[PDB]
């Protein structure tokens, strides 16, 4: 198909062929499996102290005093799981493998498939993104990689009728639950992914909900956050070309 290239003013400036991969049949099940793994693979091993509740010589009096055979020390029950201050019967364990494997092929196929869902304006709209454009992904001249101010990327985005998505991500949610106590107080919608070629866009990164990636290592997660296909993306002339062989 055809890809309408845009200049830093938001005006058409020729067009390149949309590489084949963007024709890869969208497979949300495979994409979901790729995200699930990436999300599990960064989780940290945890678990209670091996000896928590075992540091005591408590013993059971056995039969004879009208008491249950529960280990006690200084007339206080201990160790056993039903006892306050006792061990945890089946606790979290450091030894547990909390990682998920995934065949390279299966994962690469998901990458290609997520790439392809990027070229479907309907999917992109269903995923939730706000925009008033018909073509997608949004391809742009390699000059984008030279921008330096966030504000400049804003103008370009407004010119491309895509800034509305950032308006969407411009709202943080204060989550329900104790995550807050561990530093996960906030969360926010995912907006535009900017795929460049030489280096992530320093100029676009701070944009509400924006994520910056590079064509050689852009993955399933940035292409389909949370395993949902169809993220409103903006590639770079050269980015678009590199992505082709992924």
């Amino acid at each position: 198909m055809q890809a309408t290239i845009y200049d830093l003013d938001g005006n058409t400036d020729g067009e390149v062929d949309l590489p084949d991969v963007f024709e890869t049949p969208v497979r949300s099940d495979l994409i979901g499996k790729a995200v699930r793994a990436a999300q599990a693979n960064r989780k940290q091993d945890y678990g209670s102290d091996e000896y928590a509740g075992l540091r005591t010589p408590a013993e059971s009096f056995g039969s004879g005093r009208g008491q249950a055979h529960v280990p006690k020390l200084d007339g206080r029950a201990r160790r056993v799981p039903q006892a306050v201050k006792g061990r945890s019967a089946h606790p979290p364990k450091t030894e547990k493998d909390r990682s998920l494997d995934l065949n390279d092929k299966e994962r690469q196929l998901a990458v290609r498939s997520a790439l392809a869902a990027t070229a479907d304006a309907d999917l992109v709209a269903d995923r939730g993104h706000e925009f008033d454009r018909d073509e997608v992904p949004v391809v742009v001249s390699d000059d984008f990689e030279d921008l330096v101010k966030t504000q400049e990327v804003v103008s370009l985005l407004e010119a491309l009728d895509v800034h509305a998505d950032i308006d969407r991500a411009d709202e943080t949610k204060i989550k329900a639950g104790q995550g807050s106590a561990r530093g996960r107080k906030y969360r926010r919608p995912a907006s535009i992914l900017f795929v460049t070629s030489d280096e992530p866009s320093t100029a676009a990164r701070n944009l509400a909900g924006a994520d910056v990636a590079t064509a050689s290592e852009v993955n399933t997660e940035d292409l389909a956050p949370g395993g949902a296909p169809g993220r409103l993306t903006v590639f770079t002339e050269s980015a678009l070309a590199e992505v082709a062989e992924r």
Binding site: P25, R27, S28, D29
Partner: protein
């Protein structure tokens, strides 16, 4: 509890064809695809070459693999083909998707099932 959205649709399409058109193979293939993957067909070229005949579409209710040699000029329809299978077959015949078969022949006529 199938997971693949594509395999899921194919199955629904195969049913629509066996019901509307006079087809019986399509509903037959649809039932076998609904069964556990372990039971689906995994056929090599050697077997297609042995029981197929020209002008009679070979229908594999599974997947075709590239072991062995195929000389007959047949049209094979499968859920999928390994890269090699599809290459060898197109050299002397034609590899087709079940989705195309259902279209070019909704009455599923002059078809031979191979597993």
């Amino acid at each position: 509890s199938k997971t693949n959205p594509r395999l899921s649709s194919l199955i629904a399409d195969l049913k629509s064809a066996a019901r509307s058109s006079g087809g019986a193979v399509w509903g037959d293939v649809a039932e076998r695809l609904e069964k556990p993957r372990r039971t689906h067909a995994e056929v090599n070229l050697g077997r297609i070459e042995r029981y197929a005949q020209e002008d009679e579409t070979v229908v594999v209710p599974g997947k075709v693999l590239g072991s062995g040699v195929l000389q007959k000029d047949v049209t094979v329809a499968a859920v999928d083909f390994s890269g090699t299978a599809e290459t060898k077959i197109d050299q002397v015949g034609e590899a087709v998707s079940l989705e195309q078969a259902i279209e070019n022949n909704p009455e599923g006529s002059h078809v031979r099932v191979i597993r």
